[PDB]
Design a protein around this nucleic acid. Structure first.
Lengths: 51, 150, 55, 117
RNA sequence: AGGCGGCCCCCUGGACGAAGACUGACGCUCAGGUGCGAAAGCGUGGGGAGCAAACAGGAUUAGAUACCCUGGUAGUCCACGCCGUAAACGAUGUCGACUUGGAGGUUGUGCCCUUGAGGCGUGGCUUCCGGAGCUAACGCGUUAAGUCGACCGCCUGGGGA
RNA sequence: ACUAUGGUUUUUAUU
RNA sequence: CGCGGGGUGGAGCAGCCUGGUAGCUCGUCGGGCUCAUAACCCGAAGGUCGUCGGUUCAAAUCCGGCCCCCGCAACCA
């Protein structure tokens, strides 16, 4: 269940800039990626946000 | 686009003592004739006291409270945007709109003698029937019948 | 080669929601992961483990 | 009519709608509402507010039957499955328990997503 | 090749490995001839929940015999038969010797009575980049479109077809 | 991604 | 030659084991609002409760006449 922590939240998270409500989305393809741009986060996987 | 102009303000005028009395050289002023509007400042409020005399602490307590704005409406285009988006107005509008946003009869059949007119508009904003009712009270039902998005 | 009648270690490879821990988070290679999945399907038919988290 | 003051709420949520039924624990219905029958069509019934109007509309069917403290039975994948309950609490109701009772078919019929193109 | 995934049992092919043994050049290539079918079609007999060629009704539009949308038969699966055709596509016919490197998976086999999601030598499977070479250009690059050999089935500008 | 929709314009000096 | 359900702004229909609220709503007419038409949303115009009685200040809600409608040669001797 949800977060297993104290208090009933469970609140929305954003992990990307210019992506949500306005100016989005997916400014990371064709081809981009990029391996260096998020520094150490790209050394573990290429999928993290939806898988 | 990128315009960020500094906001206009008015100072209380020492002849009338308040900021609420300092705008009647602009509210109901026409053709740039500013001293022609000065001709009837604050004596129009003594003429309002000829129709309901209750002193200056009660002179606007319903003649603005009954008519002041509370919501801003219209849509915002984000897909399927065939609805309206109501938002509550900021305190910088608490004394505004109600003496400017309607001229539907004043420019069509006049609005009676000019030196008696602000004493009529401050009495009509406390009578609240016929003219200027629909443009005010429509947003007290629109914001309850079209509120499913924001 | 991996048993389905014992669950005392097999329990490590599944969540409280019944999902199997993904192949690149187990890091155990295919011969283990495929035999662990067979053991989970059998331990579920043998009533030692539940299926999904629905009443 | 006399107040009965007990019951179970049966909630169903889809990608575009939210459905509510109130029953006595004998299994017997006393009121219904949907986010569509709340006076909304198109995707206007998909809103988090149409899920609130459905809760207040089903509460309008039991207002003389006096039910305010109940337990919930939840079906279906739709995001309204919590938006109707967080609103039901703000409408003056007491919630005791929430149980997800969604079934799990062993296939049978092909999933309605199709496409197949 | 097409294709192959609920689970259990009866009958059992294909692939691959280690050591010991055997035949006796039996080795490579291939229209018709002999077998093998995805899906639908089809004779005979069943079955009908879901979905849906056909068929309507309601909408969309200038129009809508189509899209949308509510329904709906055949078809789906199964038993015995017929139908050899598909992007059956990693579009590259089959067999064979050989040429720099860097890396990701699958699986035999001997040994240690083993920090392990082990490991090494050797066999098989299956893959990504890229050097030299090859190409009009994409791209191919040891499972090469390289070096080309031994053969086979096709081809000869387009309209018509 | 962020509303489900909107068809026609004679061959023609000719660069 | 005789019966009882219905009759409520132009149509359809509730109102009725409390006797007064004129109602649900379709159409008609006019505005907000989306790309745009309709949906949506804000509103407007028009009722001799068939038609007269009983009991009454009072009857859509109960009754009785008179009339029309109703599956139907009401009987035509």
């Amino acid at each position: 269940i949800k977060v297993r922590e104290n208090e009933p939240f469970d609140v929305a998270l954003r992990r990307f800039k210019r992506s949500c409500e306005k100016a989005g989305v997916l400014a990371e393809v064709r081809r981009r990626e990029f391996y260096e741009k998020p520094t150490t986060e790209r050394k573990r996987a290429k999928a993290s946000a939806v898988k | 686009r990128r315009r960020v102009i500094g906001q206009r303000k008015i100072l209380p005028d020492p002849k009338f003592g308040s900021e609420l009395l300092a705008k009647f050289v602009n509210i109901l002023m026409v053709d740039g004739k500013k001293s022609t509007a000065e001709s009837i400042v604050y004596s129009a409020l003594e003429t309002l006291a000829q129709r309901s005399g209750k002193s200056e602490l009660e002179a606007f307590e319903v003649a603005l409270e009954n008519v002041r704005p509370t919501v801003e409406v219209k849509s915002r285009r984000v897909g399927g945007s065939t609805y309206q988006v109501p938002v509550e107005v900021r305190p910088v509008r608490r004394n505004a709109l109600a003496m400017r946003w309607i001229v539907e009869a004043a420019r069509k059949r006049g609005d009676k003698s000019m030196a008696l007119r602000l004493a009529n508009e401050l009495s009509d904003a406390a009578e609240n029937k016929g003219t200027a009712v629909k443009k005010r009270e429509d947003v007290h039902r629109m914001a309850e019948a079209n509120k499913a998005f924001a | 080669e991996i048993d389905y009648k014992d669950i005392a270690t097999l329990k490590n490879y599944i969540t409280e929601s019944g999902k199997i821990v993904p192949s690149r988070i187990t890091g155990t290679r295919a011969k283990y992961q495929r035999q662990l999945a067979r053991a989970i399907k059998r331990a579920r038919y043998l009533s030692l483990l539940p299926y999904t988290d629905r009443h | 009519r006399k107040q009965v003051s007990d019951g179970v709420a049966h909630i169903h949520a889809s990608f575009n709608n939210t459905i509510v039924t109130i029953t006595d624990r004998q299994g017997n219905a006393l009121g219904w509402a949907t986010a569509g029958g709340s006076g909304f069509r198109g995707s206007r019934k998909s809103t988090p507010f149409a899920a609130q109007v459905a809760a207040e509309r089903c509460a309008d069917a039991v207002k003389e039957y006096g039910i305010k403290n109940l337990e919930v039975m939840v079906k279906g994948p739709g995001p309204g499955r919590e938006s109707t309950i967080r609103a039901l609490n703000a409408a003056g109701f007491r919630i005791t328990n929430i149980t997800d009772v969604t079934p799990i078919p062993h296939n049978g019929c092909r999933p309605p997503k199709k496409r197949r193109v």
